Amino acid sequence: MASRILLNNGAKMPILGLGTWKSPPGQVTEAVKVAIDVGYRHIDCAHVYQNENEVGVAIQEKLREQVVKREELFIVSKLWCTYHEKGLVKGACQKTLSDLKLDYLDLYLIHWPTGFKPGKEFFPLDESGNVVPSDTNILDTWAAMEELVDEGLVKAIGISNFNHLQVEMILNKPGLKYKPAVNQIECHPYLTQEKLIQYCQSKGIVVTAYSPLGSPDRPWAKPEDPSLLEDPRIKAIAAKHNKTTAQVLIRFPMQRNLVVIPKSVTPERIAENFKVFDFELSSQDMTTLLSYNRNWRVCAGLSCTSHKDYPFHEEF
Numbered sequence: 001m002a003s004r005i006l007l008n009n010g011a012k013m014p015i016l017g018l019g020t021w022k023s024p025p026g027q028v029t030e031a032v033k034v035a036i037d038v039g040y041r042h043i044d045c046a047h048v049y050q051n052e053n054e055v056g057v058a059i060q061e062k063l064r065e066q067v068v069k070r071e072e073l074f075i076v077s078k079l080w081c082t083y084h085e086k087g088l089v090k091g092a093c094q095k096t097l098s099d100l101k102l103d104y105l106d107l108y109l110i111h112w113p114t115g116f117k118p119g120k121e122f123f124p125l126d127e128s129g130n131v132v133p134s135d136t137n138i139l140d141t142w143a144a145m146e147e148l149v150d151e152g153l154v155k156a157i158g159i160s161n162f163n164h165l166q167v168e169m170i171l172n173k174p175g176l177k178y179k180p181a182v183n184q185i186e187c188h189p190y191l192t193q194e195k196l197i198q199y200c201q202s203k204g205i206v207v208t209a210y211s212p213l214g215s216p217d218r219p220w221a222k223p224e225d226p227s228l229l230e231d232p233r234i235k236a237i238a239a240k241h242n243k244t245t246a247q248v249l250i251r252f253p254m255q256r257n258l259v260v261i262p263k264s265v266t267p268e269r270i271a272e273n274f275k276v277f278d279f280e281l282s283s284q285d286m287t288t289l290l291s292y293n294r295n296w297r298v299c300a301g302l303s304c305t306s307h308k309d310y311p312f313h314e315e316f
């Protein structure tokens, strides 16, 4: 298992990264420092996570300490939905760059296909509770992302939470200048995503799997929800390989040619989650894990279901 995958912009992306959604601002600086110290070279970020300044403190300290060189890091962030407007994309990217202490991003993603009314609120609401859309169509947002490549702010651009038809809309854009490099989507044994992964891979788009552990810290978790880390069938595969359940859950997407971004702020787990390059799941293990699909989402985007570009009405 090579550590990096080749993107359609000609750059290499580490297949294992550290997630940062929900990482508390008072813990994420140490988490990222530990991650870099134990071998991580890819950090997944977003403005909407409200912790990029603190992530950036860690990156900058490790660059200053010469633990790593900038060219060895692969830093990803995402354009939030209230910035889909032509005239707001550059400033949103620059705010992320200034918070992360960087002069470029390796990859910048459209976080969701849904644009919202700009303003201070990340989910602007009408008086009845629906998100207020923007009329900017996503093809125009894509053109604004392409500009960022041409201005040197980002090395690669991509998408996140785009369904099959929305990916196709990007690929069929009149005058398309840069194809998406990545589609970052939820993916794990309970949401295996065969249809969408095959489509993206067939077009040369690399897929990143988010919430690979089933996001046990998601704010809306309920006791009755399925739990990947506690599933005895997955624990049994882990025991057979002398690995933890989390290690199996991370290795699984790697063997599907996916990038994977488990989140932790616990130093021991950050280290555990990196120790996934020294064992192999059999084809039978892989097919068995795929069989657990039930189309279950951590991230259903429930605050934007009324938006015309909501991605999860479609089968895939």
Ligand SMILES: NC(=O)c1ccc[n+]([C@@H]2O[C@H](COP(=O)([O-])OP(=O)(O)OC[C@H]3O[C@@H](n4cnc5c(N)ncnc54)[C@H](OP(=O)(O)O)[C@@H]3O)[C@@H](O)[C@H]2O)c1
Pocket (backbone or CB within 6 Å): 018, 019, 020, 021, 022, 044, 045, 111, 160, 161, 184, 185, 209, 210, 211, 212, 213, 214, 215, 216, 217, 218, 229, 244, 246, 247, 261, 262, 263, 264, 265, 266, 269, 270, 272, 273, 298, 299
């Ligand atoms: N593009 C999008 O819309 C989107 C959506 C969701 C996620 N993401 C990205 O994907 C990342 C990962 O997804 P996620 O944060 O939803 O969840 P996840 O990575 O599936 O799970 C994170 C949870 O698992 C725990 N954990 C981590 N390693 C563990 C281990 N070895 N043993 C036991 N528990 C362990 C963490 O606890 P501790 O931290 O307390 O150790 C945390 O509660 C995010 O942080 C974000 O970067 C992107």
